[PDB]
Amino acid sequence: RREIKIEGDLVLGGLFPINEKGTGTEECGRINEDRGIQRLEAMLFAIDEINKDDYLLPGVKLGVHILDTCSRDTYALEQSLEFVRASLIPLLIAGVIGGSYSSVSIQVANLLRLFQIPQISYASTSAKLSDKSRYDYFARTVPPDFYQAKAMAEILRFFNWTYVSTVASEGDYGETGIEAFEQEARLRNISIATAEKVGIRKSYDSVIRELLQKPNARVVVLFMRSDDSRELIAAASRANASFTWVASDGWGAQESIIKGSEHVAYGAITLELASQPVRQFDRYFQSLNPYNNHRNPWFRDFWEQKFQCSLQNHRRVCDKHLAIDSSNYEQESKIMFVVNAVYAMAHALHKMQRTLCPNTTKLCDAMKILDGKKLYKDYLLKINFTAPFNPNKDADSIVKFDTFGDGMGRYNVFNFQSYLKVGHWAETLSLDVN
């Protein structure tokens, strides 16, 4: 199999959806450029930055064992066995960075707790992962999706919107989120007219009718995914219904949802995961090409797929001058979370080495037989640090986890006109005038 194995005094395992879930027969499909290639390179970028940082793990070199998940649960577990074979050629696995999808992260967390291997995910937002009776070694730099509920209800409780109607998607997201919203609304005196769930355009048209049948609530709180949100706005367009929507990140600040139904959408309050681009990362990512990137065994497949050419005769040959640049690259939204996950692990290990190895920077016999239980509970859960590549080194650039290992809730608010950043929800709400 394909992998990135780089020796180090301590090794962080990594799991990324380098490939899309394979079609019917096959395990893996094409290369996931954004969630796969970029997120993987952001790990390598952070490891490289930590290994040049004399104030972080000055005498401990970080190594990596990066593996593809193929955006599948089973494939990720088979791969994860490398991290656990080690725990017993396999390396000194101090922790695991990943995965992306929550189904992957859940299955990996299930294997990892058995061997006391700390795990930080940069993208898995399911609420299930907050259950420490099941995922006791899991932590994440991204907040759980249920925090959007707390935030959305605060946007209502500010604007005193007490009589509100709700629509929710089917599955883990909609159901766990809306249930969290209901409970947070009940806590803040807010009432529900109709709780419509959604598993044909006529089905969404039926939901709009039930939303009209209670004309008392103008405010409709939405906790749906992208495709669901887009077809319920077109369903509100067909019936020409005028509702002020307060939607989750499934809608967010994207054009996909509002395409051809802009009129019915005006003045909708949406949520989006606040993230700041890692500038130094853009420079590193764009500098990569098949001539300089031999350490990534997927980079040639990535390149060949991106530029639709062959590096190697009925295929068109790749131009030696092709480049990842401003015309074809835009930093993936979760890069900041990948970098912060890697550094949280580095910060935890650095405080551990500092404590367990008095009068040395080097990995002493105590750290050599790593107590994962101690690393997670005593170091990882107790670290707070300014994000490494955040320009404004303020209180909202602090990387910390609550008692459940969940990252800090940081969402932005977006008004519709044209999406406009009308505020944020950190621990508390913030809005302007729109």
Ligand X SMILES: N[C@@]1(C(=O)O)C[C@@H](Sc2nc[nH]n2)[C@H]2[C@H](C(=O)O)[C@H]21
Which spans of this chain sit near Mg ion (rule: CB under 5 A)? Answer: 57
Give DSSP secondary structure letters for 272-339.
EE-----HHHHHHHHT--TTT-TT-TTHHHHHHHHTTSB----SPBPPTT----TTT----TTHHHHH
Binding mask 133-172 for Cl ion (x = CB under 5 A): --------------------------------------xx
CB of 299 to Cl ion, least distance (A): 19
Question: Does 124 engage in binding with ligand X (CB under 6 A)?
Answer: yes
Helix (H) or strand (E) holding 174: helix 172-187
Helix (H) or strand (E) holding 207: helix 201-212
- Read off the tokens for 355: 């404590």
Q: Is 123 annotated as a binding residue?
A: yes
Query: What torsion do the CA atoms of 332, 414, 265, 156 make, to the nearest 10 degrees?
Result: 130
Question: Does 101 engage in binding with ligand X (CB under 6 A)?
Answer: yes
Binding mask 209-238 for ligand X (x = CB under 6 A): ----------------x-------------
Picked from Mg ion, ligand X, Cl ion, none, the partner binding residue 102 (CB below 5 to 8 A depending on kind) is ligand X
100-129 binders of Cl ion (CB under 5 A) = 100-101, 104
Picked from Cl ion, a copy of itself, Mg ion, none, the partner binding residue 69 (CB below 5 to 8 A depending on kind) is Cl ion
Q: Is 371 annotated as a binding residue?
A: no
Helices 73-87 and 102-112 cross at an angle (nearest 10°) of 30
Question: Does 102 engage in binding with ligand X (CB under 6 A)?
Answer: yes
Sole window of 92-100, 195-203, 239-247, 252-260 interacting with Cl ion (rule: CB under 5 A): 92-100
Give DSSP secondary structure letters for 66-116.
EEE-TT-HHHHHHHHHHHHHHH-----EEEEE--SSHHHHHHHHHHHGGGT
31-60 binders of ligand X (CB under 6 A) = 35
Of the candidates 38, 119, 125, 397, which one interacts with ligand X according to CB under 6 A? Answer: 125
Nearest 5°: the CA angle 129, 131, 134 is 90
Helices 147-158 and 172-187 cross at an angle (nearest 10°) of 40
Q: Which residues contact 126 (CB under 8 A, 6 or more apart)?
A: 102, 105, 106, 144, 145, 172, 173, 176
CB of 32 to a copy of itself, least distance (A): 24
What is the distance between the alpha carbons of residues 193 and 177, in angstroms, rounded to a whole number?
17
Specify the residue, 51 or 244, whose C-beta has the smaller distance to Mg ion. Answer: 51
Q: Is 249 annotated as a binding residue?
A: yes
Q: Is 355 annotated as a binding residue?
A: no
Specify the residue, 65 or 113, whose C-beta has the smaller distance to a copy of itself. Answer: 113
Sole window of 8-16, 96-104, 404-412, 418-426 interacting with ligand X (rule: CB under 6 A): 96-104
Amino acid identity of residue 282, one-letter, is: D
Picked from Mg ion, a copy of itself, ligand X, none, the partner binding residue 81 (CB below 5 to 8 A depending on kind) is a copy of itself
Applying CB under 6 A, which residues contact ligand X?
Answer: 35, 100-102, 123-126, 225, 334
Binding-site entries: 102, 123-125, 173, 249, 334
